[PDB]
């Protein structure tokens, strides 16, 4: 099902709320040990991981270097080794088991650093950093390659995207998106990299566009109904779900669904409560 961990509405949240569009409604599960927003969700071996973020509370604002797994049979969280640095507004992209932690911020410092960690040695090792410092970065994996998409460098919000070549441990700039997007929702559907919504420094976005690898072009697809940045995103059996986010005024509970074969974005259902900055994955 579609799980969402963390988020923010007045303070960082511990929530965990699996959803099933074939079930129709939601389900509440084990709370995160430490509240988190600006985190990323990913599944490795059915094991739902929660990476980086921060706890923005009435008594603090602690950037999280933590990594935490939730076995969905046992319903219990478990602390795994911590990253080299805290990463608020992180991106992550699963790659043959090993988890990739991308960019993010710690205080004033916008990372270009990247580090990996797999469920075996439970260690973090720094790899080549990105060409760009990126927080609010969207991350995707296509043909066993890692794409970092959009984000914010401290001063400029980005339309650029860059690709990590593991066998060479270097980053290469690719064709930029048509739109500057920080805090967008980025995922692979079919074999295109999708990039939905985000913020360009003036306005939240409802536009969506997708990247075709063979032609290296970013085609503009159907836009969503409600502009949103800091949204969750995931693909559930060949369709796209965006959950929550911020539109400059409101913390959204709206969940829209994109149907590719018709190119239409419909609002299937909403969340139990509006929130931004969640981690989303599927297992």
């Amino acid at each position: 099902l579609i799980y969402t961990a963390g988020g923010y509405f007045r303070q960082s949240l511990s929530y965990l709320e699996a959803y099933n569009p074939s079930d129709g409604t939601w389900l509440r599960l084990a709370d995160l040990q430490v509240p988190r927003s600006g985190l990323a969700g990913c599944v490795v071996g059915g094991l739902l991981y929660a990476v980086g973020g921060r706890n923005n509370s009435p008594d603090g604002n602690t950037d999280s270097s933590a990594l935490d797994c939730y076995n969905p049979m046992t319903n219990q969280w478990s602390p795994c080794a911590p990253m080299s640095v805290p990463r608020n507004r992180i991106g992550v992209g699963v790659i043959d088991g090993h988890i990739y932690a991308v960019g993010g911020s710690h205080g004033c410092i916008h990372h270009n650093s990247v580090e990996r960690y797999e469920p075996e040695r439970d260690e973090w090792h720094l790899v080549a950093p990105m060409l760009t410092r990126r927080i609010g970065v969207g991350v995707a994996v296509l043909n066993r390659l890692l794409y970092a998409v959009g984000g914010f460098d401290g001063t400029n919000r980005l339309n650029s995207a860059e690709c990590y070549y593991p066998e060479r441990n270097e980053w290469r700039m690719i064709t930029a998106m048509n739109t500057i997007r920080s805090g967008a929702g980025v995922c692979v559907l079919h074999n295109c990299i999708y990039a939905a919504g985000g913020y360009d420094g003036q306005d939240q976005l409802n536009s969506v566009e997708r990247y075709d690898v063979a032609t290296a072009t970013w085609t503009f697809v159907a836009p969503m109904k409600h502009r949103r940045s800091a949204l969750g995103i995931t693909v559930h059996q060949g369709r796209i779900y965006v959950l929550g986010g911020y539109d400059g005024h409101t913390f959204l509970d709206s969940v829209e669904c994109y149907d590719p074969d018709t190119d239409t974005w419909s609002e299937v259902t909403r969340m139990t409560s509006g929130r931004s900055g969640v981690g989303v994955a599927v297992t």
């Binding site: 923010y8 609010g136 913020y199 420094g201 900055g277």
Partner: peptide, 9 residues
């Protein structure tokens, strides 16, 4: 509130 995430400073 953060223009992008809405979170407080």
């Amino acid at each position: 509130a953060d223009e992008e995430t809405g979170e407080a400073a």
